[PDB]
Symmetry: C3
Subunit: 491 residues, 3 copies
């Protein structure tokens, strides 16, 4: 009746989701996406990383050449997977600083071994044992050479092996600790004497220690395992009078991205960049709470089991019912846009979405998704994060380093999502406010703000007229005389 | 005189506090709260954690059973407190990797000890010394057994102890290093020979080393202390020909939240969750600069000695004097609200607080206090952070880890408080602006904005009329004819 | 023609720079500054830190007193610089835990050495070798004393040295490992026997190990180096029957800010607070990507090679052409201010800068530059971050600690610059909006907002009138009758 109403509004949905911002612990938005990966398939995918399943073998057992590990000879890996069921089935041994040798071989990523012709003149080679059977026969570690007396003599060994290669050589060797004095004489024909293995730059002396240890596979003796790395132009010197478990050659030692993981997860024929002990996980999300132990391009481990990123505006119920605008009121009936117009005029009541404002909001939200989704970074060999034995100081430090790191990342994740969500609420509120202001400015003196997100337009404004406002081509001068007469009359 | 004035405003106080935001290094606000705890009472509260005051005993001395520590037998703790006055008063000893044994016992949290019947047939037991008196008599460590020759014989010991329990056993044992060859013969009846202590999975051999060390309590000999952990189903084997300081049994080893702290603070009868070497501290605040060493639910250590969180709006002086609104002007006379109205009309000049806006600001500020106050997280056994000896590499790493951590937290604290304070300034400014806008919209064409946070209302507006605006029930149509005539007249 | 136009605007430049905000991956601003230092001069400046260039000497060689290092005697440093060309030229030696002794001497920062008169009665002193020539003559390490038999006797040494000083003493000593049994007898007149060096609180026993090692300077023997620190009131006891390489006295050990760095950069006569292996770097910027290894007041190492901080507003092209204001439009022709006014009236078209708004923006931007520029913090002795040998566990941890730290700082840097840039865009947009609003409020009913950042002023407004608006002294009442007649006429 000589006027029209034009309301600005935004959509609302019946099934909103709660997120956290800086302003609110809980605010309902139209939509959100999860940023913490909390599940795994349960299998380790065999692609795209080269996986070596240790099965019954530890890495160190595959290194030394336990008979059940013969199939591992010379293999390489990106990730060596050690199973909890693994067990040793050869001569009982220990490795002082086992963890370091495991780590350096793991990180090298290869079991490539080159045989060398050592001069073992004057002794018997290839000693074997019933504790280490190969094909039903008494045998020994494939890569080691148990030397013993020859005709009750064991002449002093003083043997040399130059490295004339352009790469480093890793030598694995050992010392036999016999159970009794009888065994020492039976084996080496004399009282026990130290072993010295040296290079130009380093030396290691080891003393065999005769004595009973608890029997393992009926063996009260032990072998202790040692290693030496020899640089190009340097030379290995082995100097011994008995009890030497000699190397048969050297391992290549490489540098690269290889590592080792303890897991019982089955290996599957599938493709996934991120491996955890629980299985591979998708790496679309920036964070994960599956496992602190990871390999490959992985989300960062956090303590939270959920962090929701807002991907829509505040969700506001529609007040019950004349048309009304956005002030404390969303429009559940607007489904083809995020923002729009409702009008009442001589021709009826209508709605239309505003594409520009809708797309501006969507684009910005898609931008922040692009920065956070699918952007994980790769890590490879790290530190151990679970321990089967009590050790004290070094382990305390490894644990504290990891705890420190996780708490700092968890804090960053918490803040980032709160900040981002606050920004999303702000940018979507801003698009609504900007649409209102643009409309107010078009209308000039021809309308008044009713306080509810609507304008009272003080002239006849048919569908085409409303359309012109929505399209930004309304000419206020055309209607100003009519509007001013209607506004500034005296009733 | 046919018009009225209505001003919107906010409170101000005579005693503001300076805070830091993103926008300003220094901005005065009405109120702030401290987020860094910088004082302690000076006492360690004996509740709610179980405290064991070591008094004159170190943990290791209480473990071995120095006579002054007899009262500690079998005790447990959450926190063992070692005093700087502590001193050893038994046979002089050392512990290779003392720090690891201290840590693992500390973390276990128990001195529970179970005696075992070892077969020491063929030797003399219970050797004692004047360096270790108990009840005026020559004695020895309670948990160790000094074995010596019997009738000038010391037969080879080869003794076994199975672990048929479902828990791990910790064995503490030692090697006696005599001062002279005479002492070696006097004690063990033969030349010194190695000691080997083994299990199915591990072995340790130790060689006694005869020689003078500087006398301590007139003793030039030493004992070196070692330990072995034995798993269920495994067995301890002790193999020796002399110089054995034998175990009398095993310690339980537990897992849990126990630790150890160096402090001289007195223990008080009080209750506090957070313990530092300086004493317990309140844990209401999120940060603290009392000590990097903490136990329990503690604020995080930061370098800052103060960080002030704004808990009110910007504090703005009242300009000297017609009434005026919030533009560059606070109202020191408004004491029953944070925001409000002042008016001038035919009936006088008045003020009233606006409850809604005040409560909206207060609630949001209380929300952020709730997130930051009383929300500390517990940490228990960590790494050492002060050192009495120079050590090199491992200590360099422990120090760098802690320095790294503190700098990262200090940075997070600095940013968080700057961000939060900026947000508080923004939300309180926003409540003022929203109140102004709501009022502007009610008034429609009946008022004009004077530019100083006040409206000139162009009609007679008595106390009830002003009240209607404040209460949001003002009907602009009632007054529009009057107002339009007054506004758009020609003077 | 009875009206005027007044536009509000902001400057724009032809050569903008792209930065990152929270809202935009790429937004062009008028100006930016770099926060990551990415270059070095290539030289280490000799001021203000005390630099000691090791030249051909390692620290350990200068400690022991290799003849080519005689010039280093008693020197101090803030930073010891070790060169890759360095080489040893004396008796072949090793140091078990070399890295720890290097670190503790490096951190101490002094080679001050005090000679002491040990009682070496009964042996020959000052043994020398052709492997260690000094001034063409056979010689030895300056700080060590090679003792050998006297008249084919080597009586048991049992020598004492009390520390009656108020500071700690560092003793460096060694054990000679002869190449053959012949050398052992030639040198010490008897079979090899252990060396024991002790104090009241500690003990070290070392066993000489006879054997061939690969010849170095024709020497198949080795010396192994050890150290002992003696506290005030404690005493050094040296107990040996041969193979002792004895100390000639002690090194002072100090605490302070000294360290050691590997670098081949030349030392220059210049002044710079921050040293890296690549050379000194300026420390104005908060971050750097030159080297993770630093000494002194240094920017923090990050992975990014550039991070640009906005130092101006959004840069917006001027739309082509009536005058127009800031809505989607910058003014390339405004060069004496950041914000200003353009007008059209009876006297022409003019421009003037607004000083207040310009200065408000500049001051705030200068504030944030002041917080970020020239504010670096000092670090001194840290951990090693590059390694020439494979080691396993400890090295894995040192690497993981550093990687962790760098990733956390890189994240903080990324967020900080995004937040700061968002804040800069917001504060500069805000100054534009505030200027517009202040002007709108002055004009009251005498103007209408044209929607393009300009006002249509509905009265004659000559240069002085425009000036009054700009200066904030425009009196709207003077013109209101004229303006209202022009606005609310009927055409
Ligand atoms: C080297 C050897 O075979 N040792 C056997 C050992 O042999 C001695 C024994 O037969 C006596 C009997 O009088 O004779 C000695 O020979 C002397 C001879 O009398 C004299 O004329 C001459 O001048 O001097 C020689 C000394 O050289 C024999 O030396 O017998 C004992 C008791 O039966 C064996 O102990 C048992 O070992 C069992 C495991 O057997 C192996 C194994 O591991 O499978 C056999 C391997 O061939 C042998 N390996 C090598 C490289 O020799 C190993 C090795 O000896 C041990 O593993 C070391 O711990 O033993 C099983 O452990 C059982 O429980 C033992 O009682 C011993 O092996
Ligand atoms: C084991 C013992 O008591 N050792 C004494 C030692 O005893 C020898 C001495 O009396 C000579 C004298 O001729 O006789 C020897 O006996 C031989 C005998 O002649 C011969 O017939 C027979 O066939 O062989 C035996 C050898 O077994 C004795 O062995 O005397 C010296 C010098 O007086 C003592 O040194 C002094 O020790 C003082 C501390 O005394 C204790 C202690 O710590 O309290 C007494 C303890 O009972 C003893 N503990 C045990 C378990 O035996 C310890 C222990 O020996 C030391 O602590 C080891 O370092 O000593 C104090 O240190 C003083 O300064 C020393 O001069 C030695 O203890
Ligand atoms: C101590 C010494 O000079 N050792 C020489 C060694 O001397 C023995 C040799 O001349 C025989 C010959 O019959 O005689 C021995 O003397 C005995 C004598 O016969 C007997 O009557 C008496 O009762 O007993 C003595 C034993 O004390 C000599 O002891 O000769 C060998 C072979 O020539 C030398 O080896 C060579 O060493 C070369 C390096 O020489 C130095 C060096 O480093 O410069 C000389 C230094 O003076 C010496 N330092 C000291 C403190 O003595 C060192 C030191 O011995 C070595 O470094 C230890 O490794 O050697 C070079 O290495 C060459 O390749 C070797 O063949 C040996 O040095
Ligand atoms: C030191 O004490 C050890 C523990 O008592 C002892 O170990 C053990 O020796 C016995 C036999 O001497 C083993 O028992 C085996 O012997 C029969 C003999 O034919 C075999 O048929 C069986 O396999 C039987 O198990 C024990 O297994 C073994 N115990 C342990 C824990 O290792 C050492 O022999 C003693 N050492 C010396 C040098 O005497
Ligand atoms: C190797 O040298 C050591 C240092 O000189 C020496 O240590 C000491 O020995 C003396 C006695 O021999 C102790 O002095 C004590 O002796 C009288 C004798 O009755 C007592 O009354 C007093 O208690 C007096 O203090 C020293 O205390 C002691 N010094 C140190 C630093 O330990 C060793 O005895 C020598 N070793 C050998 C095997 O000869
Ligand atoms: C154990 O084996 C070692 C390696 O074969 C051996 O080392 C070396 O000994 C030879 C001489 O015996 C050195 O050669 C030098 O000898 C002549 C003799 O006049 C000199 O003119 C030259 O300097 C020549 O180089 C080797 O340099 C040396 N090789 C290494 C790698 O060190 C040991 O001698 C053997 N040990 C025993 C105890 O026999
Ligand atoms: C909600 O958000 C996510 C991410 O933008 C999108 O993939 C999903 O389809 C959205 N859901 C709805 C119902 O719009
Ligand atoms: C591993 O050992 C188990 C148990 O001894 C055996 O049954 C299984 O066949 C073994 N697996 C492989 C792959 O050798
Ligand atoms: C090393 O070899 C030499 C002979 O070349 C010999 O005399 C010596 O005993 C050997 N050393 C050891 C520790 O076996
Ligand atoms: C993965 O395994 C770890 C270690 O056993 C366990 O703590 C965790 O609950 C597992 N997580 C998932 C998602 O299966
Ligand atoms: C200031 O703030 C704190 C925390 O909100 C509050 O406990 C205190 O009483 C306030 N002081 C005043 C004077 O309002
Ligand atoms: C601890 O030792 C001191 C000094 O010897 C003694 O006076 C005090 O009584 C001792 N305290 C306890 C609790 O045994
Ligand atoms: C261990 O016991 C055996 C006898 O069972 C003995 O012959 C041997 O000497 C002992 N070993 C040691 C190192 O004491
Ligand atoms: C607590 O003790 C530490 C360590 O001695 C000291 O540096 C610090 O000043 C103390 N802090 C307080 C608040 O007493
Ligand atoms: C741009 O910014 C920097 C830092 O404020 C300033 O030093 C430089 O001179 C500025 N450049 C221009 C062209 O204004
Ligand atoms: C260091 O050694 C090189 C190569 O032997 C020599 O030429 C140079 O003069 C030496 N420099 C110094 C400072 O002694
Ligand atoms: C230490 O000195 C004593 C004599 O005082 C001597 O008997 C003993 O052999 C020496 N010990 C060593 C390990 O050299
Ligand atoms: C500095 O040296 C390091 C280590 O060699 C190298 O990686 C880096 O590229 C260098 N940086 C610059 C800016 O020269
Ligand atoms: C062990 O040595 C024998 C000779 O005794 C040789 O024939 C054989 O090749 C060696 N065993 C190997 C290489 O497995
Ligand atoms: C030490 O052994 C004796 C027998 O020599 C025994 O009676 C006593 O119980 C033992 N001492 C203890 C358990 O304290
Ligand atoms: C080594 O001892 C000799 C006496 O044999 C002495 O004259 C000389 O000063 C000592 N050498 C030094 C201190 O360099």
């Amino acid at each position: 009746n000589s006027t029209a109403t034009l309301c600005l509004g935004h959509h609302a949905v019946p099934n909103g989701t709660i997120v956290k911002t800086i302003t609110n612990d809980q605010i309902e938005v139209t939509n959100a996406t999860e940023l913490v990966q909390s599940s795994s398939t349960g299998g380790i995918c065999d692609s795209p990383h080269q996986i070596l399943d240790g099965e019954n073998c530890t890495l160190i057992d595959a290194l030394l050449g336990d008979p059940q590990c013969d199939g591992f000879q010379n293999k390489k890996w990106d990730l060596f997977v050690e199973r909890s069921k693994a067990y040793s089935n050869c001569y009982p041994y220990d490795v002082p600083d086992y963890a370091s040798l495991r780590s350096l071989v793991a990180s090298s990523g290869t079991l490539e071994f080159n045989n060398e012709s050592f001069n073992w003149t004057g002794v018997t080679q290839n000693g074997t044992s019933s504790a280490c059977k190969r094909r039903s026969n008494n045998s020994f570690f494939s890569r080691l050479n148990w030397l013993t007396h020859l005709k009750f003599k064991y002449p002093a060994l003083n043997v040399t092996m130059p490295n004339n290669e352009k790469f480093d050589k890793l030598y694995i060797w050992g010392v036999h600790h016999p159970g009794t004095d009888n065994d020492q004489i039976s084996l080496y024909a004399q009282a026990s004497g130290r072993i010295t293995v040296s290079t130009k730059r380093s030396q290691q002396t080891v003393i065999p220690n005769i004595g009973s240890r608890p029997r393992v596979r009926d063996i009260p003796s032990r072998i202790s395992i040692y290693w030496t790395i020899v640089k190009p132009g340097d030379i290995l010197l082995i100097n011994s009078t008995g009890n030497l478990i000699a190397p048969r050659g050297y391992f290549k030692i490489r540098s690269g991205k290889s590592s080792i993981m303890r897991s019982d997860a089955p290996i599957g024929k599938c493709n996934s960049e991120c491996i955890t002990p629980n299985g591979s996980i998708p790496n679309d999300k920036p964070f994960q709470n599956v496992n602190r132990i990871t390999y490959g391009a992985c989300p960062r481990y956090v303590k939270q089991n959920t962090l929701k990123l807002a991907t829509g505006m505040r969700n506001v119920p529609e007040k019950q019912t004349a048309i009304a605008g956005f002030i404390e009121n969303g429009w559940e009936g607007m489904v083809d846009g995020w923002y729009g117009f409702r009008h009442q005029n001589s021709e009826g009541i209508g709605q239309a979405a505003d594409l520009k404002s809708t797309q501006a909001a969507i684009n910005q939200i898609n931008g922040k998704l692009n920065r956070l989704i699918g952007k994980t970074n790769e890590k490879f060999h790290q530190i151990e994060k679970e321990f089967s034995e009590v050790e004290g100081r070094i382990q305390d430090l490894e644990k504290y380093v990891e705890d420190t790191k996780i708490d700092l990342w968890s804090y960053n994740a918490e803040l980032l999502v709160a900040l981002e969500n606050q920004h999303t609420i702000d940018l979507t509120d801003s698009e609504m406010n900007k649409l209102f202001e643009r409309t107010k400015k078009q209308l000039r003196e021809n309308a008044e703000d009713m306080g509810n997100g609507c304008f009272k337009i003080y002239h006849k404004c048919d569908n085409a007229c409303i359309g012109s406002i929505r399209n930004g081509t309304y000419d206020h001068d055309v209607y100003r005389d009519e509007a001013l007469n209607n506004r500034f009359q005296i009733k």
